């Protein structure tokens, strides 16, 4: 034990030295506590006469026996400071936080208790109350254990999905600090459900992935909540994440403890389309580019964020990895817990790791052009 620390710190030294030719932007910020979660808010402000734009991030804390917070931070990007705008008292670490597309003041969170919380961040003071009391705007009941998966329906305002270690997926309709019981509980998985995500176009369709190694496709119009529409043996270990391609309605991607990202076609789930290989450990997040249909990213325990270009599947080569691996981000020296593609600046990513580091970065233009 502890030779690893020498290996990591030497590799970080090579990385640091090479950033001027690998990146168009690298901002590093040390949070007071690590964040398990990261999501860019949709808004950008471009003040007249300035050399920067102002973007914003939903973050959380993970403490060891100290008061946690849901956090909104501001980031200045050039055409660059990072500041905390608000902290709201949160009961336990923030497993995951996601804004509601139809009203981005509304943020859902996953707690270490079974509760899923809803905050309207405009209804909370500037400074958190030092009493420490968590006053969520809604408490969403239905789970028996904590989890990670959290998804707002982009086509039905207020329909929230959640995945838990209790083997279940819960659905709430918040549209009517009260307690809401789950509208529907889906019980098809036989193990910890790691992630859940609505389809971006079809208001009734969602996907889940679990430690049973399965990708499941659900339809809310089905009377049978114990059996999905489709059930796919997706990976040879736990499936930790999924993400629907925002330009291609039949395409999705899953990330796994088997160290691979799988590419799927909903119309024929018996045949995995491709397996993206290069991660050296468990994958916990995968996300498609909001700007480029063929671009996907993945991160996890190997301390790397990989960016893939599926248009390069099959091309010939002289190498250090397959042709579809566009970029390896090696800026983190600990496990990466989450990342978010900036929706207003193509190729900007924010990524957060267990050693308190948040990085906002952009690979060099010549790497993708």
């Amino acid at each position: 034990d502890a030779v690893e620390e020498r290996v990591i710190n030497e590799e970080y030294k090579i990385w640091k030295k090479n950033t001027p030719f690998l990146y168009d932007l690298v901002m590093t910020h040390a949070l007071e506590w690590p964040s398990l979660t990261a999501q860019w808010l949709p808004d950008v402000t471009r003040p007249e006469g300035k050399d920067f734009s102002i973007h914003r991030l939903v973050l959380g804390t993970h403490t060891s026996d100290e008061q946690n917070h849901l956090v909104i931070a501001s980031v200045q990007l050039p055409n660059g400071k990072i500041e905390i705008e608000i902290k709201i008292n949160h009961e336990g670490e923030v497993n995951r936080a996601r804004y509601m597309p139809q009203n981005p003041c509304i943020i859902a969170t996953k707690t270490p208790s079974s509760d899923v919380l809803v905050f309207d961040y405009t209804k909370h003071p500037s400074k958190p109350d030092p009493s420490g009391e968590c006053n969520p705007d809604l408490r969403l009941r239905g789970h028996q254990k904590e989890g990670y998966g959290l998804s707002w329906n982009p086509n039905l305002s207020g329909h929230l999905l959640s995945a838990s270690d209790d083997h279940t997926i819960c659905l709430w309709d918040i549209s009517a600090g009260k307690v809401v019981d789950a509208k529907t509980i889906f019980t098809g998985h036989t193990a910890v459900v790691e992630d859940v995500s609505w389809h971006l176009l079809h208001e009734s369709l969602f996907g889940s992935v679990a430690d049973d190694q399965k990708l499941m496709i659900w339809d809310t119009r089905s009377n049978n909540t114990s059996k999905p529409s489709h059930s796919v043996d997706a990976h040879t270990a736990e499936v930790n994440c999924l993400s629907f391609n925002p330009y291609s309605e039949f395409i999705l991607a899953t990330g796994s403890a088997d160290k691979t990202v799988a590419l799927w076609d909903l119309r024929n789930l018996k045949l995995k389309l491709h397996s993206f290989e290069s991660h050296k450990d468990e994958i916990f997040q995968v996300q498609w580019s909001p700007h480029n249909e063929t671009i996907l990213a993945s991160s996890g325990t190997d301390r790397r964020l990989n960016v893939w270009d599926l248009s390069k599947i099959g091309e010939e080569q002289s190498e250090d990895g397959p042709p579809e691996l566009l970029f390896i981000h090696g800026g983190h020296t600990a496990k990466i817990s989450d990342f978010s593609w900036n929706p207003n600046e193509p190729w900007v990513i924010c990524s957060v790791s267990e050693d308190n580091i948040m990085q906002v970065w952009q690979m060099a233009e010549n790497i993708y052009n």
Binding site: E32, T63, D165, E194, D211, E238, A334, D355
Partner: peptide
């Protein structure tokens, strides 16, 4: 099922 690390301040 993920196992969260022990968080360190600063």
């Amino acid at each position: 099922m993920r196992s969260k690390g022990r968080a360190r301040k600063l």
